[PDB]
Amino acid sequence: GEIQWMRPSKEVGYPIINAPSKTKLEPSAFHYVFEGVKEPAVLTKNDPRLKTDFEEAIFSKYVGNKITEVDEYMKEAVDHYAGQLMSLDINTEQMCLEDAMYGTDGLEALDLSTSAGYPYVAMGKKKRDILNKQTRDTKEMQKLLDTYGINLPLVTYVKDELRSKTKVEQGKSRLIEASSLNDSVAMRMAFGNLYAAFHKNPGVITGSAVGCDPDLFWSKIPVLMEEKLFAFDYTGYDASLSPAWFEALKMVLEKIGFGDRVDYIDYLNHSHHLYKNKTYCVKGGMPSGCSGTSIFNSMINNLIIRTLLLKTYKGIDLDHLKMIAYGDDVIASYPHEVDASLLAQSGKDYGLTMTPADKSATFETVTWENVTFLKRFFRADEKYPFLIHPVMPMKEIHESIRWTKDPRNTQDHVRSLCLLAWHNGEEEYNKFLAKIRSVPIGRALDLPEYSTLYRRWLDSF
RNA sequence: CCAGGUCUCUCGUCCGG
RNA sequence: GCCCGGACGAGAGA
Ligand SMILES: [Zn+2]
């Protein structure tokens, strides 16, 4: 990923866009009950907590492009992945405008409570104004596609979310690219049957976890994996993606029967963003707020990992690779052990920055004991060993609970945290509820006991 | 008064067969 | 009771 320029959008005939500038996160009724280090992330340059320059820090992730050509390991990667997808028999037809807008089996409607993006955002024009779920009316959208076309620029916003201390001081505030409504509709007409096929088929054929429910899928994964696990983290994954990876994506797309709309992928490469009083242009890198990013990132991840196993371990058999990705996140296995430090090595040469799983300082054997996916651990039930708990550490549930975006939500919020927490066991769970109830508002909250959630889980199988 | 993407899963409220 | 479905809200994850 890399910027190609920046300039007053006036220069290019684009409106100025008015980001909001106050966090929406305020302290919770439980802000002092529970400990934590995170706080809302920097939204502006005029933020007191800044220990460095803002706009410089947020655009820092675009680290340049290491490659542009698809070498023969990538090519074989492509060939192997596409071959797997072909087994799913993905419907390769355009999706009708109505289904693309309103949903079909496996694809949810567009989100009516979010922005319609450029230019609708400078026209004070909203999705609710354009979309009607009840009549599923396409006429107005069709008219806006005709009028404004596609390939619009993406509006940038800083993500209002909790951030650690050094990421606040460092102004490492993650960014968001609001895809235009025109472009989401277009992307969903082209790709919707692909998204649907993926959503319906989380596992090792797609190499993707999109569409899984960790409370249930965790019990599938160890079976799906080969004998020996390996994993690692990326630094700035989406932004470190070089054009060669996108080309290789297009190659998988041609290969599974989407050849005719691979031009859409080019637009995810050469993207124009409007951020406040400016405009810029990026080359490579995948815009986060776009349609299908979640699938495309998972797919590339599958290409990346295949590529490095072929580079590093000569003669490796890809038919015994079993991997599941969620965008950059991935858990992977193989019948014999593979060294992630060696994979990280080969990574360097494709612009990929790979570090040991879970911020550990050294690369170590990844085991069913230390492995994490979607931030959860894997722990066999004591009573039923074949059923696996997704175990998210209390640490992060503690961070979440200390804040609210609207105290009106306290019941839902805290109870949702309960669903994540109880997997930590009955003794940790009951201590959680003790704490919650340690303040009056906590005693107003209807919370489920361990045994109800446990039984709920067992039943769900 | 508003304002801040793409998705998945789940919970909750409410309404339905 | 069990199942299936819808609108809205929220949490987490990527
Ligand atoms: Zn340009």
Side-chain angles (χ1 to χ4, degrees):
Chain A
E2 218 210 20
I3 306 229
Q4 303 294 314
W5 43 271
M6 287 213 228
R7 34 188 311 180
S9 61
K10 7 158 71 82
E11 320 222 59
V12 205
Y14 279 140
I16 241 165
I17 309 157
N18 210 54
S21 67
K22 318 174 206 60
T23 195
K24 217 151 200 194
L25 302 156
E26 69 217 53
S28 219
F30 306 100
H31 193 97
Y32 302 100
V33 188
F34 295 97
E35 293 274 283
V37 317
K38 289 188 194 169
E39 38 175 357
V42 194
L43 273 44
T44 63
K45 9 199 257 253
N46 346 342
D47 188 281
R49 314 170 268 180
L50 275 174
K51 188 182 60 178
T52 189
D53 190 48
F54 189 46
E55 294 193 0
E56 189 190 5
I58 73 186
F59 295 105
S60 129
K61 57 160 181 186
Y62 298 122
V63 285
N65 288 313
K66 190 122 195 181
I67 56 185
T68 58
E69 308 268 322
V70 182
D71 65 66
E72 287 188 12
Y73 299 110
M74 296 173 72
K75 242 143 217 165
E76 185 183 347
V78 166
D79 277 23
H80 183 256
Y81 191 39
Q84 252 172 228
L85 299 187
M86 290 291 323
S87 53
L88 298 171
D89 276 315
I90 304 185
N91 183 7
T92 71
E93 275 192 304
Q94 262 219 197
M95 173 160 303
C96 57
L97 173 55
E98 185 193 303
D99 281 1
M101 305 178 64
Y102 295 104
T104 182
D105 182 29
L107 198 55
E108 308 294 302
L110 285 174
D111 190 342
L112 292 180
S113 50
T114 40
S115 201
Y118 183 78
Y120 310 134
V121 67
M123 315 197 301
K125 212 187 203 301
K126 306 206 203 84
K127 270 165 151 152
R128 306 216 176 260
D129 294 330
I130 303 156
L131 274 87
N132 185 271
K133 297 200 174 185
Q134 172 61 44
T135 67
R136 292 177 70 97
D137 184 58
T138 68
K139 273 171 301 182
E140 173 70 355
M141 183 66 252
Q142 182 54 78
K143 172 192 161 300
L144 290 185
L145 276 169
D146 292 345
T147 300
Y148 292 106
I150 66 171
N151 224 272
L152 302 138
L154 297 68
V155 188
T156 321
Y157 301 102
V158 184
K159 191 182 162 102
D160 188 11
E161 32 147 23
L162 289 169
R163 219 92 183 94
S164 86
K165 212 181 42 159
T166 74
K167 308 271 200 46
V168 172
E169 297 181 337
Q170 236 66 105
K172 308 272 57 133
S173 293
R174 295 191 301 158
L175 288 173
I176 292 159
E177 318 301 324
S179 164
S180 181
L181 176 56
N182 277 38
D183 286 304
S184 308
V185 164
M187 282 296 270
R188 295 156 59 117
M189 284 187 292
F191 292 123
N193 292 310
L194 179 69
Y195 306 167
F198 264 80
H199 296 166
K200 284 194 203 70
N201 291 284
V204 290
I205 317 304
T206 60
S208 169
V210 192
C212 82
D213 168 4
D215 292 340
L216 295 174
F217 194 59
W218 258 231
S219 284
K220 267 210 189 180
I221 290 171
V223 167
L224 293 187
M225 292 296 93
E226 294 286 357
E227 175 79 23
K228 304 279 179 177
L229 306 187
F230 71 92
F232 52 94
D233 289 353
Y234 303 87
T235 314
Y237 172 85
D238 304 26
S240 89
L241 295 184
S242 74
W245 292 115
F246 291 92
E247 275 307 320
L249 182 56
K250 300 167 77 183
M251 277 179 274
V252 175
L253 296 180
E254 289 150 18
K255 228 124 163 154
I256 64 168
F258 285 77
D260 43 322
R261 36 253 206 253
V262 307
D263 280 17
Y264 277 87
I265 301 309
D266 293 335
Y267 308 155
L268 297 176
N269 274 235
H270 193 82
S271 34
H272 294 73
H273 313 242
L274 314 166
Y275 165 53
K276 223 194 188 175
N277 84 139
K278 296 185 313 217
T279 289
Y280 54 118
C281 163
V282 190
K283 279 278 177 65
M286 201 170 285
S288 47
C290 291
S291 161
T293 58
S294 180
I295 305 266
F296 299 144
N297 280 345
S298 307
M299 273 175 97
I300 294 165
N301 201 316
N302 279 259
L303 288 185
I304 287 174
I305 292 191
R306 274 158 181 80
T307 287
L308 307 189
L309 284 197
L310 294 171
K311 161 122 176 216
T312 304
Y313 290 85
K314 158 194 157 174
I316 199 154
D317 188 20
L318 288 193
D319 281 34
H320 293 301
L321 165 67
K322 291 322 158 84
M323 60 161 287
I324 305 184
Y326 209 130
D328 63 320
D329 206 337
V330 75
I331 190 186
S333 72
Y334 193 80
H336 309 291
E337 122 86 7
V338 344
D339 184 1
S341 61
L342 302 179
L343 296 172
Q345 168 56 34
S346 318
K348 315 182 176 179
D349 295 346
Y350 296 93
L352 292 180
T353 293
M354 304 154 65
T355 68
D358 296 30
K359 303 175 168 184
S360 336
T362 32
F363 286 80
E364 278 141 80
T365 294
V366 165
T367 52
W368 280 123
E369 179 95 356
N370 60 344
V371 70
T372 69
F373 194 37
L374 314 182
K375 296 223 160 95
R376 300 132 154 100
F377 284 84
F378 296 73
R379 295 289 187 262
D381 193 58
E382 296 174 49
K383 207 179 297 193
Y384 306 81
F386 45 104
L387 307 172
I388 310 293
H389 290 285
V391 185
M392 175 181 296
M394 293 299 317
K395 181 161 168 276
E396 353 225 55
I397 290 145
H398 292 159
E399 303 276 6
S400 168
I401 206 160
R402 303 187 57 228
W403 304 81
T404 168
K405 274 172 179 274
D406 184 9
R408 181 228 125 91
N409 291 317
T410 299
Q411 175 76 79
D412 288 354
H413 184 188
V414 176
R415 147 166 250 160
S416 278
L417 294 188
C418 280
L419 291 207
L420 299 164
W422 78 274
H423 285 293
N424 275 277
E426 190 174 15
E427 172 190 335
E428 252 287 18
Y429 186 61
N430 287 332
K431 158 168 35 214
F432 190 46
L433 303 186
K435 293 266 229 148
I436 289 181
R437 296 169 169 147
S438 92
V439 302
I441 281 179
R443 295 175 214 107
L445 305 176
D446 174 76
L447 313 175
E449 302 313 274
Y450 193 82
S451 66
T452 315
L453 299 167
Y454 191 54
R455 161 70 146 172
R456 220 214 163 111
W457 191 58
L458 298 175
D459 292 346
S460 79
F461 284 102

